[model samples]
Target: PISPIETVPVKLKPGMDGPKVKQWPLTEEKIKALVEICTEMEKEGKISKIGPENPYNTPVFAIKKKDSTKWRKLVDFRELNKRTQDFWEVQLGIPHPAGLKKKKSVTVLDVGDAYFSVPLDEDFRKYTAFTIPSINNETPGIRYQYNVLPQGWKGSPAIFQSSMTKILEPFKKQNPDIVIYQYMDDLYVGSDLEIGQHRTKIEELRQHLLRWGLTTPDKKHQKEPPFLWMGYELHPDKWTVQPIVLPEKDSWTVNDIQKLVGKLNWASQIYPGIKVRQLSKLLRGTKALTEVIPLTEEAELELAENREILKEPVHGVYYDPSKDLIAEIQKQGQGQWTYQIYQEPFKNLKTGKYARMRGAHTNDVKQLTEAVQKITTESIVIWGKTPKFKLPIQKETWETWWTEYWQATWIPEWEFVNTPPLVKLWYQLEKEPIVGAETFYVDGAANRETKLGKAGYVTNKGRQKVVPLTNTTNQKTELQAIYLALQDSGLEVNIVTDSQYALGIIQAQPDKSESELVNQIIEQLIKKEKVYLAWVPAHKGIGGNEQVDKLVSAGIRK
Candidate 1:
C-alpha cells in the first residue's frame, strides 16, 4: 500500500497554454544530494522516468535539513499551479481550547511522507514532471515525474484528506468514546482516561493507519500530556492551554518583532487577560522589517513578565450576564487616558491594586469617556483618581471657581507685568550674505488709540500684501510681518525686517513658541534653507521698507 490510490487528475483552464518552468541552478554537492533522493524515490515507486516532451516542467531544489546529513527536495510548481484549477473545499476540524478542556490525556500522530503515500493518476503524471541537471560532465540531464502525490501541488492536501476521511470513518465509528480530531495529516486523539489508556488507543490508531498504507513516524509522535498541538501547549490535568514561549535572542529585527506580535496575538486568544503593553511598545518602536532593534530596559522587563504570564496555567471563565461589569479608567501619563473592562474589579498581581483587561489611550478625556459609555452601557466605572499637578482645569470648573471664590477682586494690569527675565540659551543663526536674490522689505503698524494692528511686505520684484489683525501688540505685529513675508516667498530669497525683537526671537529657534505665527515662520525657514533673514532700520530711505510701512498704515485705517 505504498502507493495508496490514484488521485483525481489536476484540471486546467480550457484556453490556458502549457506552463513549464526552467530548472534552477545548483552546486555539484547539491546536485548529488538531489540525485540520491530521486534514486531512492524511484526505487520506492514514488516517481517514474518521463520523456523530455512533457508539456509541464518544474524545477526541483534541495534544502539542507538541520541534521546536515539529509536534504529535503522540493518542487517549484508555481508556474503550473497558476494555470491549475482550485481544489474543491473539504471540511476539516480545527483544534480549540474547548476541545482540550476536559480531556485528561492527549496523543498526537504525524503521518510519515504524508503526500507521497497516495499515487497520482497515470494520465496527469506528465503535468507534474521535474527536470534534474547532470551531476557529472560525462552525461546529459534527465527528466522524471512524481507517480505519487507530491508536495506543493495545490490539490494534494484535499485529495489526501478525502482518502484519509474514507479510511478513518470505520475506526471513528468503532471508537465512539475517544475524541479524535484530524487537521490534514496531523491527527490527535484526546481521552478522559489516564495516560496508559491514551497510549493504548494511540497504538490502535497507528495500526489502523498502517492498514490504509499511512505510516506515522515515531519521532514526530506526541504520546503524553503537556504536549504541543498547533501552537498551544495542552495541560488537560490543569484544564488550561498556554502558548509556547518565544525563542531567546539578544536582539530582533523588525521582521522578528512583527512575527512575535502575531504569535502573542494568538496567545492572547488563549489567555485573554495577558498584558499587551510590551507588544504595543515594540510595535510602536519598530517600522521596516529590515531594521534591527535591541530591547530597551522597559521592554526587557515586560518581556520577562509576559513570558512568565504565558508559562502559567490559565483557568477558564464564562460570561455571566447577571454579574455587574466594571470599567476602570486610568491615566498612563501626562495628557493620556485609558480604560480597562472587567466583569469585576480586577487588579494586577505585580503592580498592586490596578485593574486592567484591555483598553486604549487618548488625550481627549471627554471623548474617551463618551466612547466608554457608548460601548458598554452596563459597566460601573471606577475612576483612577490621582494627584493632578499643573493639569488644565476644565472650562466649567474654571467658570464655577471664578464666580464663587473671586467675586469682587480687582487688580491693575501693571501687576501682571514680567518681574524676572528667563535665562535661556541663545541659538546663533548662520546668516548668509543677501545677494543674487530678490529682496523683500516687511514692516508692521499698530494704532495706539484703537488697539488695531496691521502688517505688510513689499518685494523688489513688485509683489506686495497688507494684512490686518486684532488685539494689537507692537512686537507681535512686527513678528507677524516677517511671517507674512516668508509665507509664499521663493526658495532662495532675502527678507529684511525693521524689528530687532522679531529677529532675535527667530534666531533663538523657539521650540515652544508662544505664537503659532512664529512657529510657522520657523517651519518655513527650515524647509527652505536658503531663505535669509536680515535686519534693516525703519524709514531709512529703503524704498521697499517705506512702501510696505505705508501699505500697513493703509490697512490699519481701513
Candidate 2:
C-alpha cells in the first residue's frame, strides 16, 4: 500500500517583467536524464510507486499560459510570491483562499539535516559498505574523507529554509492566521487554533517537500500532531522538553575529597576528642576501630609519683623529700634518714655562704640576730632610694651639694664632663686672650635675699671656648648664666663641663628616667652650637667668669 502522489507547481519564469515571453525550454536531453534517473531509482527500490494515485510518488507541474503575442510562455507568479500567505490557510477552511492576505502569516522554516567530515584516518571501505559515500579518493592505508554540514556556512541554513518557504508560500498567503519561524532543521508553526492547524501545516509542508525530491521520516510525520520547533516542544496545554528527564549526575574528584576533609577538620575543632580517623574510615566504607586499653596498678602508682613531683616547691631552704623540695634543700639524702633534720637560716648566716659559729663564749643567738638586722636594714635603704636625682632643688641647701653643683656648672654646656679639652696651655707661660665675649644671665631671690649670676665664654674662630664661670657657691645659677652667654656669642663652638653625673645622663645613648631634661637640652642645642661650660676653681676671678657675673647683675637690675 503506497502513499498517494502529490503535485507541486514550478515557476518557469520568475515574474512577468523578469524575462521575455516564451514557452519553457524543456530539453530532450534533460527529460531523458530525469527519466533514466527515475528508472534507476525504481530498480534500486528508491521509489515503489510512480503515479498520482500512488502514495509515495510525487509529480511536479509547470503551469503555462499564452502571452498577448500568442507565444505560449510560462506565466510568472513572482508577484504572487510577494503576497502574504501561509501553509495553514488552505487546510481548515471550506476552500483555500486563492489571493494573499493583508498580513503575512508565520511559517516554520527548518534548516536541513546535520552532516560531518570523515576523519582522515577513518576506514573509507567500511563507511562505503555501511551506505556512507566517501567524499574523496585515497589509498587503502589512508582514511575516509567526508564533509559535515557547517552551521556558519554562508547561506546554508537560508537556502534550505528558502526551499521550504517556497513550498508553503501559497498556502501561507491564504492561511493568514499562523506564525512561522525556522532555524537550521528546527521549525515552529504557531496559530490560535491548536487542534488541527499544526497537523495540517506539517502535512502540507511534508507534501511540498515530497514534490521537491525531499522526504521527511514517516514516524516524524505521524508525530506531527504535537510537533517541536527549534528546541520548544509544542502543545495546546503546555510546552516542555521533547523527552523530559533528570540531569545526569556529575562525577566526583580528588578536590571534592579534600574539601570534605577540610570541612570535617573545621568541625573537629569545635567538638573536642572527635574520632577523626573513625569518621574518615566510615566515609571510606571501612569498619572503624573501637578498642579501649585499661591502665595497670603499677602504672597508676607511677602517675601518682609524677603528680607529686610536679607539686614540689621551687624555692626555700631545707631538704624535704616527701615535700619534694630536693634541689633547693639538702645536698644528699639517705634511706635511713627519713626523719631529716631541717635547718633554717640564722641571723649570722649569709645566703650562699657557709654558716659558721663565732666563739662558744659569746651570746651566739644575740650577735647573729644583730648582724642579720644590720644587713637587712642596709638592703632596705638601698632599695628605697630613687635611682636618679629629683628636680627643682636649691643648690645652697641641697644635701648632695657636690653632685648638684657638678651637674649645674658643667652639664648645661659640656653635656659630658669627662670629655677632655682638645688643647691645654699653662697660665705661667702666657695668658690666653678672650677673642669674643658674650654673657649668660640668671635671676634668683630667696629668703629676702636676691642674687644675679652670669657666665661668659671667649671664643676664637675655629676654636672651642671655655665658659669662664666655675667654683661658685651657686654652681647651678652660674651654669645657667653660662648657657645664655654662649647662646648670645653667635660663635660656632663646643663648651666642656666637668659634671660626670650630669654628662653621663645627658650623653646616655638610650632613654632613661632623666630623659626629659636631657631631651630638653638636646632640642635647644640642635638650634645653635655655641654655649659651653668649663671646670674651673670656685671663687677664682677667671676673666670670663667676672665678665659674665657683671652681665648677670646688669640684666637683673634692669
Candidate 3:
C-alpha cells in the first residue's frame, strides 16, 4: 500500500534555505545534565520503554504470573516502529485491522508501552530528541543519530496502549462482566450477552475512555453478529457451503434467458388471451422453432373482427324523423318533407347515391365569404397594430421623434440582433430611423440583453447623438458618463445600457476603499436620479449605440 508523505515545519534564521543542523559537543557538564534529567524522569515514572523487547534484548514483561520474577518492564520500540512502513500505512487508509468494525461481544485491550520508531528530518532532529528522550540518549557515541520513544511521540501508539493497560489493571482486578482487549491503538470490548447487553457494555467502555481523556468511535460499535471484523466481513448469516452467484458469467447463458422468459410468461398469464395473437406473431420471428406456437385462425379472425367493430360512429343516426309511422292521419300533412325537412341524420345520407343534397344555400355561401373577409381583415389588423399607434409626423417633429425612437429602441435592438435576415433589417433600420416613433420594433435578442444586463440607451434629439448606458460593467466609467450627460440641457437621457452590475453599484453607496475614480463618479450620481441608465445588449447592430461604439473604438485607436 502507498504511504502518506510526512511534512515537518522547521524554524530557521531569516533568509536561510533550510533548517540549521548543529552537533552539540559532549562535555562533562552536558553529560551530567543529561544524566540528571534522565534520572529525574525515571524517578517520576515518566520514562519507560514500550513494546515486548527491551534495548538489552531481555523480555520487558511476562504475561504469566508464575514467571513474575523472570518478567521485565515493557520495552519501548517507538523509534523502530516509526522507521518501519506501518506508520505510514496506518496514517493512510490502508487495510489495517485496527480500523475494522467489531461485532457483538468484543474484547478491547489497550496495550501499554508498545514502542514505535519515528524518523525526523535533520532540521527537527534536536527538538525531537529533546522531547522524546527514550531514543535520545539510549545509545552513546552515535554521532548524528537521533532516536527516541517519548510520551505523546509521533510513534506513541504502542506507548498509548501500554499506558491504557496500566490504567485498566485495577479494573481488571475487579473481574468485570465485559471482556476488554487492546492491541496498540485498537481496543475491543465484548460480551456473550444479548445485543442490548453488548451495547450497554460498549457504552460503559466508551464512558471510561472519556474519563481518561481518551475516546472511541461510536460508529464502529456493532450489535449485529454479521459485520466487518479485522478487514473481513464476519457474516454469520451468509457463511454457508452454497455456491456463489457470479452474475457476469451467468448473464449470457441459456439458463439466464430461460429464467427471464419464465418470469415474462408468468406476467403474461395475468392477462392471458388478451395479447394471444400478438404473442404468436412475436414468436414466429423468434429463432426457437420448437417453442414457436401459432394461434388458431379463428382466434386471429375473431381478434381482427373485434378490432373493426370497436371503431366509434362517424355521425348520429335516426330511423324515424317523421312524428311517427302510426301517428294520427290529421297530423300527417303537418310533417310534410319540404326542403325545410333537412334535419340532421337523414336516413339517405349514409346510404350513398340517393342521399339528400348537402350543397350550401345562398345565405351559407354569403356567410362563408363574409367569414373569410373577417379573418383576413383581423389578420391585417394584427399585422398593422403598430401603424395604428404610430403618431402622424409633421416635418418639424419628424426628425426628433425618429431620432428618439431610433436611439431608444432601434439602435439597441440592432446591436443585440442575432437572427440573420432580422439582423439585416435591424442594420437597415439603424442606418435610417423609422419615419415615426410608433414604428418601434423590438427583437428577442434585444429584450433578453436588456433584461439580463439591465441596460438601456438615451438620445440627444438636438445633437443627434445616441448614448448607450450599460450598468453591468465598470461602475466608475458609467457613473462618470451619466453624471456628465445629466448636467447638459435639452439632453433627453433615453438611457440604454444593459449593465445590472453597474446599476446595482450606482444605486448602493460607493465603497470607500473602491478605486478613487469609481468612488468619485458614484458620489456624483447619489445626488442625481436624472442620469438615466437604460440597458442595451452589446454586439447588437442597434443604430445609435452601434454608432457610438464605432465612434468610441475609432477614438481609442486614434
Candidate 4:
C-alpha cells in the first residue's frame, strides 16, 4: 500500500552536461535476480520500460541482504552525482542519548522502504534510468528507469527526509508535550511527564502515517526505552554500543573491512578512544572491494581491545544547556594536547544524587567548542586555568594571543600562571635583535600520486639539511622545513619560505587548525630571540631558493 504523497513530489535537476554511461557487466545469477526485481517493480508501477533514446543512463547493481536471500537493488550514480545540482540541505535532528537522559519512557518507529514510498517528479524520471542486462535467451536486454525515488540516488535521502518532515509537522503540533525526533524514516517519540501516555500518540501517528500511504509494520510497533535506537542500545539512564559481530576469519575482504570500520566509526563518536585508526591503515591503495587483505598483529590487538571497551556502558554524554560548562586543557607528554569538557552535575536517576559528568573528551579544542555551541541554548560561564603547555614562544605572548582568541569567541575567565619560572622568563625577548642575523631559504617537493615529500632548507652561512617525509603534503613539508630551520642554534635568524599556506598559519589566522605540524612550528618560533618570515618567488634564480629547491629534489631521489 506504499503510495506517493499528494502534496510534494521530489524533484532532482541534473546539470546540463550529465554523465551517460553504459551498464557494467553483471553475473548470470545477479542478472536473473535483476529480472525478478524489474518484474516486481513493473507490477508495483515503481518503474517502467524506457526507450534507448534517453540521454542519461547509469548502471544498476545488487548487493545481497543480511539474510542472503534477496538482493537490494542499487544504481551506480557516482558519475551522475557529480553533475547534479540544486540539492536540498537535509538536517536530520536525530537525538543523541543526551536527549533521552532520565526520561520515563521512549519508543522508536520505523517506516519500511521510506524512500520508494515518496513519489519522484515525473519530468526527472529519465535522469534515473537504468538498463537491465539480458538473461541468456530468457529475456531481451531492456532499459528501465525508476518512477519513484531510487535507493542509490544521492538526493533520495534529503528529498525523502524533506517530505517526511512535512508529514510529521501535523503530528508534532497536535501533541506539544510529547517529544519526537525523525532521522529519514526512523522516528523516536518519548515523554518524561507520564509513563505509557506516549503509546496513544505513537498509535495515532502510526494510523496517520498509514493514511498517507506510508506503512509502519506491526512488528516494528512501539517498544519501551531499552530498545536499539540507531546502533546504540538506548536505556532511560544510559546508552551502550551494540556488540559488533564479525565472521571467524583470519583475513578480511575490503568490503568486510569497510562495513566493520563504518560501524566502528559511528561507535567512535560515543567511545572516541576506540582504535579504529589502526584497522583503517589496511585500506591504503585498496581499489577493489573483493580484494582480500590480511590483518596485522597490531590491528588484531586493536580489534580485540575495541570489542572489550564497547562492552562497558557509557554513563555520561548527558547534555543539559542550563548547566555551567568548564573546558580543561592539558598536555599528555611533549607533543600531544587534549581538552576535557565538564558540566556541573545533574541528579542521577538511579542514585538520586547530584554528580558531575564529563561532556566531551576531545583532542582538538575547536571540536570541543563547536560541539558546545551546537548543544548550548543560553549564555553559560566557562572558567579554566591556562596550563604550562610550553610552546617555543614566550609564555606571556602565547597566553595573550590565546586569551584574546578565547575571549573573541566565548566568555573564558582565565586563571594565568601567577608565578613565572626563571628558565621560561629568559625566553621573553623584549626587542627583535636586528644585528648579527643569518637568512635561511626553505623548499618542499611532493609527489601527490605516491604521497611522498621532502623538506630542505639552506642558510646563508652554508648550513643545510634535507628531511624525507612520507604520507604528507607539499605545504606540510614546507612548514616542516621552516620548523627545522627555526630549531637552529642561531641566536637571531630570518627564515624565508615560498609557501603562502605555511606563512598564513604563523603570521595570521587561528581557527581550529587540526595540524600538529603547524602547532609545532608555532611552538618552535616562540623559542627564537628574533625570527622573521618573508616570501620570495620560486624558480626565479634566487640564490638560496634555487639551492634549497635542488636539495629537495635530491632528498626525494634518496
- Once superposed on the true structure, which residue ranges of model 2 sit more than 4 Å away at CA? 1-155, 194-201, 224-234, 240-251, 254-558
Error of 2 at 496 (Å): 50
Prediction 4 TM-score vs. true: 0.53
Candidate 3: segments with Cα more than 4 A from true spot: 1-25, 36-152, 155-460, 464-476, 489-494, 498-504, 507-517, 529-532, 553-558
**Candidate 3, RMSD to the unseen true structure:** 34.9
lDDT of 1: 0.61
Candidate 2 lDDT over residue span 277-315, tens digit each: 322322343222232223244433433432343234122
RMSD of 1: 16.3
Tell me each candidate's TM-score.
Answer: 0.52, 0.20, 0.26, 0.53
Worst 10 residues of 4 by lDDT: 348-357
Could you tell which candidate, 2 or 4, scores higher by TM-score? 4
**What is the per-residue lDDT of model 4 for residues 1-558, given as tens digits with 9 covering 90 to 100?**
556565345344532554588776787778877879889987777888885677677888887767676676767777666656656677734444533435666677787788777777776677787777775554455778777777777777777877787777787788776666776668777777445465666778788888777788744355655676567676655665666664447668888887877767666545534556556768775478788878888778877776786667444444444554443333222222233344544322110011111221222233323433422321221122221121222345444444645345552343333322211222222234355677777777787888888887887778887778898788778888888887773767777888887775655433223467765665565656677777787778887677787776664464
Best by TM-score: 4
Off by over 4 Å in 1: 24-32, 52-55, 88-95, 98-100, 133-141, 219-224, 237-267, 270-558
**Lowest summed lDDT over 10 consecutive residues: which window, candidate 1?**
348-357
Model 3, span 72-96: residue lDDT tens: 2222324333332323223232332
Model 2: which ten-residue window has the lowest total lDDT? 331-340
